[PDB]
């Protein structure tokens, strides 16, 4: 099984639409993370979580909320999608000296 599954893998949204990205891990790590990729650069942290019912702000939290309702699931929420949020998004789960990534979500906000 894939250590981390993301859904959707591809998304086209209209400006002002509510978009939710799901990340499902299978290793039940305490820590989960949502990143967006700076095109041709690095990953930028949006929100992360230390466990169920916890979320913390990363380096670029504005425009996004997050939810950790269970050990396996970490959701990223764009309450009102803006064009600047067009990007590739990667979820990760980590713990016990491991860090796994999802295969990425391409989101386009027209």
């Amino acid at each position: 099984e894939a250590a981390v599954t993301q859904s959707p893998r591809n998304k086209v949204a209209v400006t002002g639409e509510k978009v939710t990205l799901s990340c499902q891990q299978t290793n039940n790590h305490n820590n989960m993370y949502w990143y967006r990729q700076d095109t041709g650069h690095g990953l930028r942290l949006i929100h992360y979580s230390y466990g169920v019912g916890n979320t913390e702000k990363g380096d670029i939290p504005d425009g996004y909320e997050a939810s950790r309702p269970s050990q396996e699931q970490f959701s990223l929420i764009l309450e009102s999608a803006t064009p600047s949020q067009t990007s590739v998004y990667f979820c990760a789960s980590g713990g016990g000296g491991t860090l796994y990534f999802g295969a990425g979500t391409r989101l386009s906000v027209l």
Binding site: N30, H47, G51, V52, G53, N54, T55, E65, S67, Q71
Partner: protein
């Protein structure tokens, strides 16, 4: 009767720079509830473990409730009780190591009342009035309901905050519309006590440490108790 709060006694949301969703989480459609249960285990002298299954998601099948001390735990250990309280998972532990995941388990404080003789004479509910003040003005009032004659302050508090999250955005994901807030209970005998509703200053919010205030298992008479919520803005 506890001394009433001075503005310097109250936590300010403007001084909390973390995620208010972590406080919201504890009160927004969130609680453990079970009827007619008896404890099955303990971790430490002051705690009790119950077989209670999650009725929202499937996150747990056992609940550890921590009491103030071992004598309070001994009060309830072999009793048939009902349970109602706010549960947490981060730093929910059953050994000396802090960050261990304990699958199938959740943690809370207090929330226990004897079952027998504690219900109204027809499965009926008791209303408890909550008066809400915003900048000293009573702008909104509502009732919370309980099946219990003697009900934990914790249960009433959770019900009030859940309502106020929904109707007044008491807590939002980032911050709160309110600067300060406290919930005050007024008992028939004149006794008063209150809890600070806002997180401690800084970046992190320690859910376990916040909820520890409920460990006294304080109960009130639902038929006669009064509740006031006092909020200030900005």
């Amino acid at each position: 009767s506890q001394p009433d709060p001075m503005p310097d006694d109250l936590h300010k949301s403007s001084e909390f720079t973390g995620t208010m969703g972590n406080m919201k989480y504890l009160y927004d459609d969130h609680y453990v509830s079970a009827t007619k249960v008896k404890s099955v285990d303990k971790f430490l002298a002051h705690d009790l473990i119950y077989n209670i299954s999650d009725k929202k998601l499937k996150n747990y099948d056992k609940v550890k409730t921590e009491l103030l001390n071992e004598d309070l735990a001994k009060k309830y250990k072999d009793e048939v009780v009902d349970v109602y309280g706010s549960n947490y998972y981060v730093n929910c532990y059953f050994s000396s190591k802090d960050n261990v995941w304990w699958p199938g388990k959740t943690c809370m404080y207090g929330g226990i009342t004897k079952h027998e003789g504690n219900h109204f004479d027809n499965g009926n509910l008791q209303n408890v009035l909550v008066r809400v003040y915003e900048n000293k003005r009573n702008t909104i009032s509502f009732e919370v309901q309980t099946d219990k004659k003697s009900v934990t302050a914790q249960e009433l508090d959770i019900k009030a905050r859940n309502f106020l999250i929904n109707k007044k955005n008491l807590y939002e994901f980032n911050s709160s519309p309110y600067e300060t807030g406290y919930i005050k209970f007024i008992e028939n005998n004149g006794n008063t006590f209150w809890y600070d509703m806002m997180p401690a200053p800084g970046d992190k919010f320690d859910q376990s440490k916040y909820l520890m205030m409920y460990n006294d298992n304080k109960t009130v008479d639902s038929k006669s108790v009064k509740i006031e919520v006092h909020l200030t803005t900005k």
